[PDB]
Amino acid sequence: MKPMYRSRSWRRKYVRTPGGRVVIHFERKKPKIAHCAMCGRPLNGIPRGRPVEMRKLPKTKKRPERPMPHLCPRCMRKVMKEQIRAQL
Amino acid sequence: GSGTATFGKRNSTPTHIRCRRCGRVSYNVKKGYCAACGFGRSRRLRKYRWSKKWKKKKNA
Amino acid sequence: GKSLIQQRRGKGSPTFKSPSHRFRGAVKYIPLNYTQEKTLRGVVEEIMHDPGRTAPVARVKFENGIEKLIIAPEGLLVGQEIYIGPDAPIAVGNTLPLAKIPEGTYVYNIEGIPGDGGKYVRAGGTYALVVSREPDKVIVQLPSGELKAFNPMCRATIGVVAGGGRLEKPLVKAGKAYYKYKARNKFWPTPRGVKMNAVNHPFGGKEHHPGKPTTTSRRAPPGRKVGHIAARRTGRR
Amino acid sequence: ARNKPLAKKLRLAKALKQNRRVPVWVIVKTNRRVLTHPKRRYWRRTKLKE
RNA sequence: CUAAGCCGCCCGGUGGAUGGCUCGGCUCGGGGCGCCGACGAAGGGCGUGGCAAGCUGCGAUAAGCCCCGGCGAGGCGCAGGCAGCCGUCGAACCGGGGAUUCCCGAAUGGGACCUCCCGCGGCUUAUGCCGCACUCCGGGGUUUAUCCC
RNA sequence: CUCGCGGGUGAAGCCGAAGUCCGCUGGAACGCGGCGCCGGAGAGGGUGAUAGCCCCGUAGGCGUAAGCCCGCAGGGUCUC
RNA sequence: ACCGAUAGCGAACUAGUACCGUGAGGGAAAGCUGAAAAGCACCCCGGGAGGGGGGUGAAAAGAGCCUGAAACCGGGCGGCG
RNA sequence: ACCCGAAACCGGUCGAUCUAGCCCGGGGCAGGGUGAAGUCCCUCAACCGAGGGAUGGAGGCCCGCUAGGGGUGCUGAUGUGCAGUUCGCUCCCGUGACCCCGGGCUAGGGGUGAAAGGCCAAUCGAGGCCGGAGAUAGCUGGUUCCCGCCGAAUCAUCCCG
RNA sequence: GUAAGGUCCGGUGGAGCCGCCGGUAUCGCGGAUCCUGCCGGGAGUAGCAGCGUAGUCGGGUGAGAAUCCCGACCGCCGGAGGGGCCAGGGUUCCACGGCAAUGGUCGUCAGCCGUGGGUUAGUCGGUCCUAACCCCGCCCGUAACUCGGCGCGGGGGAAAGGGAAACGGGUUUAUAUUCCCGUACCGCGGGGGUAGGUGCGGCAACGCAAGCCCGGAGGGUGACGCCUCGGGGUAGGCGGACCGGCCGAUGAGGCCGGCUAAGCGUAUAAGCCCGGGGAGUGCCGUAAUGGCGAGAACCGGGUGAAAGCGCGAAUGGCCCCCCCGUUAGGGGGGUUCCGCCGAUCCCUGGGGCCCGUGAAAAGCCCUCCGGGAAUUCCGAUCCCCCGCGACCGUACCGAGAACCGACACAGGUGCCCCUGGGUGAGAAGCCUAAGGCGUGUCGGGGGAAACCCGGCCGAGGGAACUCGGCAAACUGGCCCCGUAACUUCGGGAGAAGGGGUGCCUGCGGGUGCGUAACCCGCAGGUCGCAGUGACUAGGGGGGCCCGACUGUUUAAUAAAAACACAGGUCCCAGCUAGCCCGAAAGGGUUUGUACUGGGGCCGACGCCUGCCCAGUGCCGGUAUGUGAAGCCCGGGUACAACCGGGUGAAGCACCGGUAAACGGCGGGGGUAACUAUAACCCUCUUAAGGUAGCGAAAUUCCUUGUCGGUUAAAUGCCGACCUGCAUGAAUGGCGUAACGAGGUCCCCGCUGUCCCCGGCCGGGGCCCGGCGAAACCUCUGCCUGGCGCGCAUGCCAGGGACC
RNA sequence: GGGGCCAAGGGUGGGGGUGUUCACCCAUUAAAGGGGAACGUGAGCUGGGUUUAGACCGUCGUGAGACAGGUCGGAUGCUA
RNA sequence: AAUAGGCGGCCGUCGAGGGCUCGGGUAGAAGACCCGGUUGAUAGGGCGGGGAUGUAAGCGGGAAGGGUCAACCGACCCGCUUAGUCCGCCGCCCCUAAUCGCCCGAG
Ligand SMILES: [Zn+2]
Ligand SMILES: [Zn+2]
């Protein structure tokens, strides 16, 4: 196989085509899930994928519909309560 | 070792390639300068009075 | 003859150069113009292991928006608040001018002159004792046991450097030593001059023994200062 | 070898075109005086200068 | 009428000496001429012939294109061939002056692990042209930027 | 300085005398013997051999755009 | 009053050419038909290369081409054997 | 200075595709064994405590013709060789101080060196290329046609002789 | 002609050449292990074997066939000799026409020769980003530069790092993700409609089409080490049924085919999270570690991968049958399930380790800040449609003949990525399927020897061989029992030693829905010399020296006791330091700061490391002596040169510390008591006179020291003695478990090492047909005794001898 | 048994330590003789000793180093 | 054996005696030597003898057990069976091939 595909950054799958031939399919590994800014906890509502897959989706299908989507719900409530208490 | 077996490891990148200035295969590609005319390192040509190749070129 | 390792180190070849790109950056204080006549509070964001530092480091985000790297003192807490300035409380992690530190306190990261950035007592598990406070100088006892005088406006941090006690555990393995010294690109393994060749070392020769006394004069030229340099005494006292 | 810069490819092409026999009509014109030229090459034995 | 072998003569093979030849060298009193380049040099890369590989000469107008003058019937290089063409509206050739003159190269708007690529503004309908390196000199503008003309 | 003129020099280059007369050898005369001619030209080369007179050329002369040099004439500047 | 193709410049010629070394750099060998190609038309043999006749040329000088020494090899001849 | 031959010395430049060291980015090592820390469980006695079984996967650990790496003995084959360092059997390491690849840096009295004067392009007690250079030597070798006339010496003094 | 030579006669040749006089010169050849060219004997000889011993029979082609082509049979690799693809090579690629040369033989053949042709991209790679690092401009240094350099500004730097997008069928002699057909995707721009600007459902996690343009900030992803384990999935494989074909007896049975890409739509698993809930004489849970009032059991619910499923898609690919068959074609069927094993290939989570912390940037997504228009209007990340996507590489080998090593080189580069069935733990060994090959390329003959190299066996004895058990042999896998001295308590250890092992007929146990699959036992019968029957596959034990161990070393005669190592200890240095490069500028240690940087010696671990500072060295002081220039004073000079004196730093003299600094640690006077012994013991030359340990030693001359053990026999080995020529405490002393291709001695066993050698197998050797050299070579080549430069094939006197 | 003469046809062996020749020792034997042949015999073998390049110990030297002092390792070309 | 020998026989002044080719080892590296060659048992073949292993394939019966305790499977044992296979040894039988042909040779 080609030296570029000899690297482990590609994932290799042996696929048999309709004509009976055996070919090797290559593709890039998917990125990991997004994490909370503060506690570093996995987030929700943010699908995994490469930039092409992200651009394939609309805006509302990539983040939850609530303020501060970059924080987990616990941190979001923490920040909101702290902010309102400081304001009042 | 040090002989025939070691001579088989010459399949790496060549040390010298063709030079855009003097036309000789003496351009150090890793260091980016010519070992014959000094192209890429000196504005003026690499000439030395103890060297006779530049005179050989013109039969002088 | 040939060159010595100490001579070759002076030419800065990659065999002897520090790999100062694996590290987390330089640890220096905020510019003195910010600290003087004004106290700032910063929040500790993370604590990290610097490959070559001998001590752990920490990131601090200051009220003014500056992110800095500091040597974390023992007991520092992530998310903790620290103060730098003249009006900061006496506590671990705070940086004060030397004239405002009560005598008998342990400090670290002492500036040689006001505003340089800190030069003294930065290794893990070290501290210095503030002995006296005078209008012209502040006396501090350093880890080596020397009482040094500092300008009263020099900045220092209270506490002790984390990571002390390393030497308690033996390295055991030549491989452990290999990784330890490779992390810093320090010359290892090391040869012996007595078993070197005469061309290479003053002590070299077929008979493995120095042919001359090993205490070398301080006036010896480069390439001759090996062994005990300007030794007042030798042996076991 | 698989990936070649254009200039190197052109130089190889020039050498390939250079390597060929002397025309028979040229031999006849010179009256068997010109038979061969110095630039003949065998790929396995005589390598290119580059 | 001795088989192999040895020496000598003749003829033959192998080889390339000797002899003769010379459009090449070497040396020299005297005589002539002595710099080329941003109006882009010298060295080099690649192309260019109907049949064309090397050398030589030329540059996409590519063993050549144009004008004045000299020579006067042949010409298409080294290079003895086939075919064909150019020339008396004066060719070939020679001296003078012009046109074209790819790419790299001081190489210069920015880059070179390949003498190949990527750029920014005016003109132009568009084709396609003209400007933009660094270190300075004499000026102008203002934004005072050594930024622009 | 040349709106102007004259001269010199100055690229290719042009002119430049005298046997292809008989006999012999020869594949082929530049050779041998005989009979001639020019010559300020008998330096040298080619030509089917070794050639003053077969050809180039030499001895000696001629022409030449641009450029350069000198001069005439007119118009100016400057110095003692 | 230089050399005459192992000489003379390294190069009398497709010579700083071919070739050697990563590199700086090093660097050869190689001239001659005849006056004119008139460069062998035709015949027999051979798979071919070429051989034998026959032609050209004053002379094959036959292109593997001016002369063709020596070393070396094959045959005949004379002597020994 | 009749001709040839030195080991060597000096100047300026060229080399880290071999090999030595370090930096950046990557690829790889079948199968089995042993069983460290940690975490526990069961039977009886209970003032103490005895008996039995599990789990767990650490190691510059072990065997191993996996791949890969090395080169101990045969002082085997070969030794105008397949080869200017090779081949066979035997042997050693094989999760680590491991093996390899691409992009980089360190250049000659200098580099690099787990230190053998080892390695730095088949060259290393100071590399290669060209120049000084036709270096020098009391040391070795060579010095080309004929005839004719006379014809030696290796012993005294002085020289780092 | 004494000659160096000259001149004549006879041939070849076709164009120049000579006598005499006087000048000039690269002016005379056997040597220089001389230079250039050519040619000899060696020689029709060596080699064309050893690491993979491969061909044979018919037919064809062609002038010519061991070597070229087709069929069959026999073989070899089969974890690569197969498949794919770098660097390097550069046309070696394909067809046709050929054999002058090349090919280790031949050649009709070819990687050879001649003639024509061959590389098609928006999606693959470069191009983009940045890493180690490099370059240019300013600046400083240099006599100067093309030289050296810190700091700023700019640019480069990966064809295996990051990084937008495509798959399947067919097509050519040679190109395919590139060409044709089918079906898709990304970037930019454009034309409609719509969501939104101005909208909703959930307590919640969240579900949603959820405004447009410009600038900025934040967060995420990009984005990462080593070891180990669980869970989900897919390639691949196994067994059964059933449609077709082949083989088989048109028996049983065996073998072949039964296939399915991107792209679209679609869900859960683990993790995490949300709402209800309110526990402990605890509860729940994992393979394991574990979780809980800081919120557990238990209920519902959200977000979340690899995959599977549906379209793509059966007209496609595959297998089969039939009509036509001079030639060229045309049609009709199957292409369906079940049950297992299962990856090193993917996805996802636990856990453990670091004195080791295992990249950056472009890019992409979201949110938030301000700014700009939008109302008969603005307008998408949503649906439909149209236009444009440049430049360069793309053939082929990829190696036992397409690369490097001069080669069609048994080396190196590339083991760089992958491996069906059986036995088996196994990617081992052996056999075999697919795929490849008969080109690790000269063939033929043969009791056709001797001898050499590889292999097998060998009676009786068993190391008697040899420097030495070199080489070979013995053991060998798995299960059970059973295991010593010593010890750092972990080891030694698979110590040692003993028993069993096949096949067949059944039972029982583990996990399991299963009589599926993989393992674990029991009883009986039975065969052989031999049951790990081939293959694979440790021999063992007891002493001594050295080094603690793993590891490194003289590429090409030394792999070791040498080097390194963790540990010990000593020295310099508080930063503009200590040490170091340089001509300087500046720089390395330094993105450092005494638990640190730099410099020596010893060298795990256990017990310890004694005396000496006179000598050399280093450090501190330096009152005092000496001590250069400069300065001052007097003389001298119409001014100087010059002479005398004063001041006088560093350095030496002088004083003190310093031995895990270099190094040393004798001698006598003596010694008495018992005879030797002299042991305690007292004193002087110079600093002190070797302490604890060890001793004929890797150190011992005499030396094979003496005594004891080992043997029948002992220049050996082990223990001891001390007379230590010439041991000794960090150039360390002593001891030491484990470890060792280190040196060394002994015991059992084993054996052709030997007594004493003998058979057999394959490859050479030998003959025949081909291609075909080299090292070397004064000419030659019989002996005895002599002469001689003292050891003659060649000389002297004899002897012998056909080629 | 001791001494001596003629006589060279044949034999004169096997083992232990040591690189050993030699010498010593063991059991047999009639005996277990001394020498020459380039200290016969490496284009026949082996490579243990000796005599390079690595390394350790003792002694000497300030040192680089040295030791006819020990000790471990260290290549043997052939087509007559 | 350089005094390079003796004797018997055959041939010569076309021709005695040989060589290659042919079937084989009492032999052997090539050469050479030895037997046989239709005047024949040299080799092959057929038959027989004598040997070396150790009782073939096939069939019938049994078999520890299983199975519906049936059919059927079963390592292995027994009889046909001193079997079968092979023979680089021997005897008899011209059935096949030792044939055709070429060459040297004293005068
Ligand atoms: Zn959070
Ligand atoms: Zn150049």
Q: What is the 3-state secondary structure (H, E, C) of chain C?
A: CCCCHHHHHCCCCCCCCCCCCCCCCCCCCCCHHHHCCCCEEEEEEEEEECCCCCCEEEEEEECCCCEEEEECECCCCCCCEEEECCCCCCCCCCEEEHHHCCCCCEEECECCCCCCCCCECCCCCCCEEEEEECCCCEEEECCCCCEEEECCCCEEEECCECCCCHHHCCCCCHHHHHHHHHCCCCCCCCCCHHHCCCCCCCCCCCCCCCCCCCEECCCCCCCCCCCEECCCCCCCC
Q: Which residue of B has its CA nearest to D11?
A: B18
Whole-number Å distance, CA B16 to C1' I640? 71
User: For residue C107, what are its two tokens?
Assistant: 């400090």
Q: Which nucleotide is nearest to D46 (CA to C1')?
A: G19
Residues of B in contact with D11 (CB under 8 A): 18
Q: Which residues have CB under 8 Å from D28's CB, separation 6+?
A: none
CA distances from B31 to B25, C8, C39 (A): 14, 23, 53
Q: Are B25 and B18 in contact (CB under 8 A)?
A: yes
Q: Are C47 and C58 in contact (CB under 8 A)?
A: yes
Q: Are C158 and C75 in contact (CB under 8 A)?
A: no
On strand J, nucleotides with any atom < 7 Å from a protein CB are: 55-57, 59-66
Task: Report how far ligand 2's centroid is from the alpha carbon of B58 (Å).
Answer: 17
Binding annotation of B? 19, 22, 34, 37
Please state, in angstroms and rounded to a whole number, the distance separating the CA atoms of residues B38 and B15: 15
CA C119 remoteness from chain centre: 8
Breaks (C-N over 2.5 A) in chain C follow: none
Tell me if there are at least 3 CB pairs under 8 Å linking chains A and B: no
Binding annotation of B for Zn(2+)? 19, 22, 34, 37
Identify which of C130, C193, C122 has the alpha carbon closest to the alpha carbon of residue C160. Answer: C122
User: For residue C116, what are its two tokens?
Assistant: 């340089």
Answer for C232: CB within 7 Å of strand I: yes
The H or E element that residue A24 is part of is: strand A22-28
Please state, in angstroms and rounded to a whole number, the distance separating the CA atoms of residues C123 and C50: 12
Residues in chain C: 237
Please state, in angstroms and rounded to a whole number, the distance separating the CA atoms of residues C219 and C196: 24
Alpha-carbon dihedral sign for residues A32, A37, A39, A42: negative
Answer for A30: CB within 7 Å of strand I: yes
Q: Which residues have CB under 8 Å from C70's CB, separation 6+?
A: C27, C57, C58, C59, C60, C109, C157
